Amino acid sequence: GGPIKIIDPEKVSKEPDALLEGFEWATLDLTNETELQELWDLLTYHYVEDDNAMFRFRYSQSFLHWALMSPGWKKEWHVGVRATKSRKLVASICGVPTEINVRNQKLKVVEINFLCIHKKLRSKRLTPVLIKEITRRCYLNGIYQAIYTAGVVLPTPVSSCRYYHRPLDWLKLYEVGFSPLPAGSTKARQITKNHLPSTTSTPGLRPMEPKDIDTVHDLLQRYLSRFALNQAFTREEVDHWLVHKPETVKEQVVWAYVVEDPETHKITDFFSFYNLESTVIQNPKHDNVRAAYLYYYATETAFTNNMKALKERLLMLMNDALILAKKAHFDVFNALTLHDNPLFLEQLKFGAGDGQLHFYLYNYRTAPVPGGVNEKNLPDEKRMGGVGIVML
Ligand SMILES: CCCCCCCCCCCCCC(=O)SCCNC(=O)CCNC(=O)[C@H](O)C(C)(C)COP(=O)(O)OP(=O)(O)OC[C@H]1O[C@@H](n2cnc3c(N)ncnc32)[C@H](O)[C@@H]1OP(=O)(O)O
Ligand SMILES: Cc1ccc(COc2c(Cl)cc(-c3ccnc(N4CCNCC4)c3)cc2Cl)c(C)n1
């Protein structure tokens, strides 16, 4: 694989294209709490909903702060559209920089996320205008490739992964309409099926600490190298994406746990998950779902290349992740079929979701990458080794 075209730096336009009458471009400054609030107000009412209009992602302000001001970030890549008269923010598209490995070619890219148009401005073809503009701003800073995910099918996906959902509070999920009562069954029986232990089992498991950064960095990079498409983590990115900062982050978004071997005291495993709520759009009993999403993880067991041993170790580690997520009062635990996740999803009672997430590269060609599922869209241990990046 390789780039599709080379961008002529001499010909990148210094001025943005025109917008629909009454609207104008605005760079957002997310260090300004008022502007972070504006973006949150947009996403909270206008961002991704399920096909039944029951739920809407509810990224928190703390989450947006974390997701968008990661190492190397630039305000230029936080793009808004405002109404000229009212000044109201009516659209967004955001990028942050990172490096990816694509079949062991390292690439500098932007991750594109939080593309959003106010419902009242939909179906006006503003999307290609948003895309063209953030493209321009990236080209001006020497970035010519992107990676993104979307639930919609667009030309040439690099992979596709299915969503899986592990009930933690089954009753709540039943009450909000997410989890069914299967027919011959009862509330009690579904609660029993989803019952978790009160304590974790992996010896040496503890919360990640700043002192763990270098060793988690090394382990994660070695583990991620097992995937054709992966995120090439820097130390700063380990710090930012995995180590919660309680003194300056009042609403926690990231949880990370390491396994400190009781004998050697070396870190042999780790896992992490993040907090992303969904608004329950119309329900007298509840107005949000508190979801934990599986993020990055790694284990030394992987490198023996013994599949049964890796499956065993993940079964223990990930059940512990469910236990910890429950203790932190999450309702559900979500994962995709990427990484080695097909090894444990079904046996740990993750239910198959309706959702698929498609992965795309901009201005970069490579062969399709396995996404953890077979042609029936079911988890398959022979279709891993492909997607090693998790996007928010
Ligand atoms: C080097 C740097 C490059 C950087 C950029 C790399 C590319 C990044 C690309 C973006 C990565 C975003 C990653 C995320 O954030 S994915 C999250 C997307 N956001 C949401 O789902 C929020 C709820 N929905 C909305 O806000 C709107 O419905 C959106 C804004 C999604 C579409 O608004 P609207 O419904 O009013 O549509 P339109 O009339 O303006 O435009 C119609 C055109 O737009 C194409 N469309 C529809 N949905 C998507 C989508 N999710 N990705 C890319 N394109 C999409 C569509 O096929 C059609 O194309 P075509 O008919 O011309 O073929
Ligand atoms: C708020 C909401 C939306 C959709 C669904 C159903 O399963 C999904 C379905 Cl069908 C789609 C998506 C989805 C759709 C569009 N975009 C995304 N992403 C998430 C990754 N970053 C880009 C945007 C996810 C996510 C899930 Cl979890 C659920 C359970 N909840």
Residues 128 and 371: their CA atoms lie apart, in Å, by 27
- Decide whether any atom of ligand 2 lies within 6 Å of the 56 Cβ: yes
* Residue 225 belongs to domain spanning: 145-392
Question: Dihedral of CA 340/366/116/6: which sign?
Answer: positive
Q: Determine whether 351 is exposed, middle or buried from the number of CB atoms within 10 Å of its CB (0-12, 13-18, 19+).
A: middle
131 Cβ partners below 8 Å, 6+ apart? 93, 115
The residue type found at 120 is K
Does residue 297 share a domain with residue 159?
Answer: yes
Question: Would residue 322 be called left, alpha or beta, if left means φ above 0 and alpha means ψ between -120 and 50 degrees?
Answer: alpha
Nearest to 204 by CA among 255, 266, 273, 295: 266
The closest residue, in CA terms, to atom 38 on ligand 1 is: 125
Active-site hit among 173, 317, 348, 392: 392
> Which pair of tokens denotes residue 246?
């309680």
Residue finishing a domain among 98, 115, 144: 144
Q: What CATH code is carried by the domain that includes residue 92?
A: 3.40.630.30
129 and 174 assigned to the same domain: no
Q: How far apart are CA 52 and CA 186, in angstroms?
A: 25
Task: Work out the number of other CB atoms within 10 angstroms of the CB of residue 6.
Answer: 8
How far apart CA 64 and CA 253 sit, in angstroms, is 10
Same domain, 153 and 262: yes
Q: Which residues pair with 298 in a beta bridge?
A: 270
Q: What is the largest CA-CA distance in the chain?
A: 68
Same domain flag for 139 and 153 = no
Residue 125 annotated in ligand binding: yes
Alpha-carbon gap, residue 118 to 357, rounded angstroms: 22
Amino acid, res. 349: K
Tokens of residue 100, six digits: 């990816």
Looking at the fold, whether 235 and 365 belong to one and the same domain comes out as yes
Method: X-ray
- Phi and psi at residue 267, in whole multiples of 5°? -80, 120
Distance 247 CA to ligand 1 centre (A): 37
CA-to-CA separations, 164 to 229, 290, 302, 344, 356, in angstroms, rounded:
21, 15, 22, 11, 10
d(CA 375, CA 59): 32
User: How many CB atoms are closer than 10 A to CB 63?
Assistant: 22
Q: What region, left, alpha or beta, does residue 176 occupy, with left being phi > 0 and alpha being psi -120 to 50 degrees?
A: alpha
Q: Are residues 304 and 354 in the same domain?
A: yes
Distance 63 CA to ligand 1 centre (A): 22
Same domain, 316 and 205: yes
Neighbours of 58 (CB within 10 A): 21
Q: Say if ligand 2 is within 6 A of residue 346 CB.
A: no
Cα–Cα–Cα angle for 167, 173, 177, nearest 5°? 135
Distance of alpha carbon 286 from alpha carbon 280, whole angstroms: 7
Q: Using CA atoms, how far apart are residues 56 and 288, in angstroms rounded to an integer?
A: 9
What 3-state class would DSSP assign to 70? coil
Cβ(116) – ligand 1 distance below 6 Å: yes
For the chain, the first-to-last Cα distance in angstroms comes to 26
148 lines ligand 2 (CB under 6 A): no
DSSP per residue over 135-182, as a string?
A: HHHHHHTT---EEEEESS--SS-SEEEEEEEEESSHHHHHHTTSS---
What is the atom index within ligand 1 of the atom nearest the CA of 154?
Answer: 57
Number of structural domains, the chain?
2
352 in contact with ligand 2, CB cutoff 6 A? no
Task: Give yes or no: residues 171 and 25 share one domain.
Answer: no
Calpha distance 303→297 (Å, rounded): 14
Residues in the chain: 392
Q: Is 123 in contact with 160 (CB distance < 8 Å)? A: no
Which residues touch 70 (CB under 8 Å, ≥6 apart)? 96, 98, 237, 240, 241
Is 324 a known active-site residue?
no
CB-CB neighbours of 240 under 10 Å: 18
Residues 21 and 159 placed together within one structural domain of the fold: no
Q: Please tell me the distance between residue 367's alpha carbon and the centre of ligand 2 in angstroms.
A: 25
Q: What are phi and psi of 297, to 5 degrees?
A: -155, 170
Q: Which of 225, 26, 34 is nearest to 134 (CA)?
A: 26
Considering every ligand atom shown, identify the ligand nearest to the alpha carbon of residue 281 and give its number: 2
Ligand nearest to the CA of 116: 1
Where do the H-state alpha helices sit in the chain? Answer: 33-46, 61-68, 126-140, 170-175, 187-193, 213-224, 235-242, 307-327
